[PDB]
């Protein structure tokens, strides 16, 4: 199907139907473009990519012209040079002289391509003046300066096709055509802020980031996002000690150039409510203390209560790094304790998926195989709010194929068509035995996705029993090459905590009345027991409900201030990279446990990060293989699924409620973010308010 074409005397070979601009990139030839993006639908409204076909008297747009065999393409003839200068002059005819006051200045594609391909002088001296366009209000996240738009429709194409928000379009005709929503309303989409990156000009810019920096000042660090369990790769920009903005970076296997509005706009919470100094409680007030005094008080408080084997309880939050989890586990183990768990509210003391088999709690199919899915079953999950990027990937496959998505549980506003079945296990039993289960059996690459909120309901055991029986009894779900069982988590620490076995499988242990509670970033502890006489130590980076419930507070560093290990929902090990230092006298989270261990008579054998990381290999061999998913073998996977099949367990018929209540408030950083406060007031908890009540 390959066609051997020519681009400026260079042999190229690509799939049939590929655009010329795609073949030119493969040949190393650069063609200017404004309206073309490799992730959006084809448009030809900008005319900047014009090339000359060898035998044809017309100039073809390389982004839309299909490739042919024997086609010879010229891209640098004087005729094309005339076209590039002419199109550049038209673009800059009505463009406002705003570069000094425009946030796109040092990273403007219009500036760079006009410099590279346009003329050095303009000829617009008209006394009538340029076009003036009023600024549209579309919420507190996207700042609009519509004079600078070049009518390239990247925002329209993205919000309609990728984001699935059809309230944004082009209204008007000719020179009076204006991008926007026509009526006075906001853009309601968890992925709306990606429109800022796609806009090549300053027409759409970040409102929190407005005026605060220039791109040449910023330092770029390639790290991962920890606001969800996808582990989306991001590029954190810093200016000295402060993080300025968060941008996505390309990874076709995880996030594919997109991030949610929560990921890129919660960075302003790193400057608010931070834990910078050790705190010691004296009655009803917290007072500052030194690290030596704080650690000594914990040791003194440890001997005051004299906790026994299972009276020492350790809780790990959603943003807790893996090095600290193992260090806390080993310190807990050295004290003869096994009462370790996460701050979740799972009904069964051992989670229904368990921790013995990795395949029982990971995305075994991996995110990149959603492109090949034919049937998808959603069991009590809301991908739009739990995994915003992964939700958009399902829509992309849904649009370009006959993929059918069935949903069991609480209905939600979706970006694609959901074949809803019910809101309990009873419907799931009917579906897997009815026509819905026949589609999965006949599907070549079926997908089954269980939400993280299933284990937080009273029917957690029934849901995993129904799927496991169906998965084991059908030979197409589990094959040597394909694995259709997936679990979609919403916290970046769950899979890392389960890989190291940081969970109690003994119901008797978890019911112990603890006397020494070590909160490692745990904040969802309203429904988790904390005795009034128990000694509580909180270790984290933000002051929240966890800090208020503590007696001694140990300040830690955030994910941007430490090289930390996080395992995402598909079992991919990723390591963060430190961009700045922690504020005040905050330390690395795994060093606080190590230092406190010497004060408790349980000195850990860890001294440096390499020794700590070598301990990760001892706990699990796959924890030192970054960016690599280690799959579970076919034979072992079947045993784990069979272990989930539990006969003689009743189904209570309760609602499979979605776990997330407020999309913008899911962790300490997001809650502390002033931008998320504006989002809740304007967009709402479920991003359902179409009118902005805080914008005048």
């Amino acid at each position: 199907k390959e066609v051997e074409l020519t681009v400026d005397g260079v042999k190229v070979s690509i799939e049939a139907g590929s655009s010329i601009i795609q073949a030119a990139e493969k040949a190393g030839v650069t063609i200017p473009r404004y309206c073309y993006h490799e992730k959006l639908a084809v448009a030809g409204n900008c005319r900047m990519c014009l090339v000359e076909i060898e035998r044809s008297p017309k100039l073809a747009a390389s982004c839309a012209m299909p490739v042919q065999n024997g086609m010879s393409v010229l891209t640098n003839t004087p005729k094309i040079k005339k076209a590039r200068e002419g199109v550049t002059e038209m673009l800059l005819e009505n463009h406002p002289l705003d570069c000094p006051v425009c946030d796109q200045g040092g990273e403007c594609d219009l500036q760079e391509q006009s410099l590279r391909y346009g003329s050095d002088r303009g000829r617009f001296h008209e006394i009538v003046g340029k076009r003036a366009v009023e600024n549209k209000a579309i919420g507190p996240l996207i700042k609009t300066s519509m004079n600078r738009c070049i009518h390239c429709t990247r925002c329209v194409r993205f919000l309609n096709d990728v984001a699935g928000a059809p309230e944004f379009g082009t209204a008007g005709r000719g020179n009076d055509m204006q991008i926007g929503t026509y009526v006075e309303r906001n853009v309601n989409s968890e992925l709306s802020a990606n429109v800022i990156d796609l806009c090549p000009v300053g027409a759409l810019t970040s409102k929190p980031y407005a005026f605060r920096a220039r791109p040449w000042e910023l330092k770029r660090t390639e790290t991962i996002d920890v606001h969800d369990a996808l582990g989306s790769n991001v590029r954190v920009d810093t200016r000295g000690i402060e993080v300025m903005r968060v941008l996505p970076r390309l990874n076709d296997e995880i996030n594919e150039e997109w991030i949610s509005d929560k990921t890129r706009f919660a960075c302003d919470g790193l400057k608010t409510q931070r834990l910078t100094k050790p705190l010691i409680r004296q009655g009803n007030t917290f007072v500052d203390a030194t690290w030596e005094e704080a650690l000594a008080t914990i040791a003194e408080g440890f001997q005051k209560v004299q906790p026994k084997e299972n009276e020492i309880k350790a809780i790990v939050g959603s943003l807790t790094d893996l090095e600290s989890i193992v260090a806390l586990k080993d310190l807990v183990n050295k004290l003869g304790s096994e009462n370790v768990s996460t701050d979740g509210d799972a009904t069964t003391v051992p989670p229904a998926h368990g921790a013995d088999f990795r395949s029982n709690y990971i995305f075994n199919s991996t995110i990149d195989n959603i492109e090949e899915a034919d049937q998808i079953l959603l069991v009590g999950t809301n991908p739009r709010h739990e995994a915003a990027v992964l939700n958009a990937r399902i829509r992309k496959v849904w649009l370009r194929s006959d993929l059918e998505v069935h949903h069991v549980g609480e209905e939600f506003d979706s970006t694609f068509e959901l074949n809803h079945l019910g809101s309990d296990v009873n419907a799931l039993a009917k579906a897997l035995t009815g026509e819905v289960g026949k589609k999965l059996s006949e599907a070549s690459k079926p997908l089954i996705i269980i939400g993280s909120g299933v284990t937080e309901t009273q029917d957690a055991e029934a849901v995993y029993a129904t799927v496991a029986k169906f998965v084991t009894s059908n030979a197409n779900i589990v094959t040597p090459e394909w694995n259709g069982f997936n679990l979609l988590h919403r916290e970046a620490s769950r899979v890392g905590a389960l890989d190291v076995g940081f969970t109690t499988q003994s119901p008797e242990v978890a019911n112990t009345k603890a006397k020494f509670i070590y909160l490692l970033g745990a904040d969802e502890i309203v429904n988790k027991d904390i005795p009034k006489d128990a000694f509580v130590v909180y270790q984290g980076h933000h002051g929240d409900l966890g800090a208020s419930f503590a007696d001694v507070i140990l300040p830690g560093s955030a994910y941007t201030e430490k090289t930390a290990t996080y395992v995402n929902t598909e079992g991919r090990v990723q390591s963060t990279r430190a961009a700045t230092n922690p504020p005040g006298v905050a330390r690395e989270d795994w060093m606080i446990i190590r230092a406190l261990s010497e004060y408790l008579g349980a000195t850990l054998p860890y001294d440096n990060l390499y020794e700590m990381r070598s301990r990760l290999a001892d706990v699990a061999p796959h924890l030192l293989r970054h960016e690599v998913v280690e799959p579970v073998s076919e034979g072992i996977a079947k045993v784990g699924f069979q272990s989930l099949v539990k006969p003689g367990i009743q189904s209570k018929g309760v609602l499979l409620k979605n776990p997330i209540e407020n999309f913008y408030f899911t962790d300490v950083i997001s809650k502390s973010s002033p931008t998320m406060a504006k989002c809740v007031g304007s967009f709402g908890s479920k991003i359902e308010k179409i009118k902005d009540e805080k914008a005048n």
């Binding site: 795609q22 590029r235 000690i241 230092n581």
Partner: protein
């Protein structure tokens, strides 16, 4: 290759026993469609966990003690970067660049 050229370079011993360098290829910026910066391999050093940046109280200046904070080496090939890092006896690690999967794109797909 095997020669320990750090014994004659004159650089301090802290570059070997205390600092970690990253060999990487720069990722494409999400705000621009250019790919020129992604054609070269670069080496930089991880920040110091303390003293990388602190605020000078007199004028608010960004004070630092890391002398390698502003040094970024440029290489044309990955092998050249590895050979130089090995020659200087540096503790390093390689970040493999992410490659974009190729998908056919045509105007006809807007309706089919």
């Amino acid at each position: 290759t095997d020669l320990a050229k750090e014994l004659v370079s004159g650089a301090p011993k802290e570059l070997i026993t205390e600092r970690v360098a990253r060999i990487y290829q720069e990722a494409k910026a999400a705000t621009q469609s250019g790919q020129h910066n992604t054609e070269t391999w670069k080496i930089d050093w991880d920040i110091l966990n303390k003293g990388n940046r602190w605020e000078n109280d007199l004028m608010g200046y960004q004070s630092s003690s890391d002398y390698m904070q502003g040094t970024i080496l440029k290489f044309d090939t990955r092998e050249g970067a590895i050979r130089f890092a090995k020659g200087q006896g540096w503790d390093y690690y390689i970040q493999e660049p992410k490659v974009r999967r190729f998908v056919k794109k045509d105007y006809s797909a807007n309706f089919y």
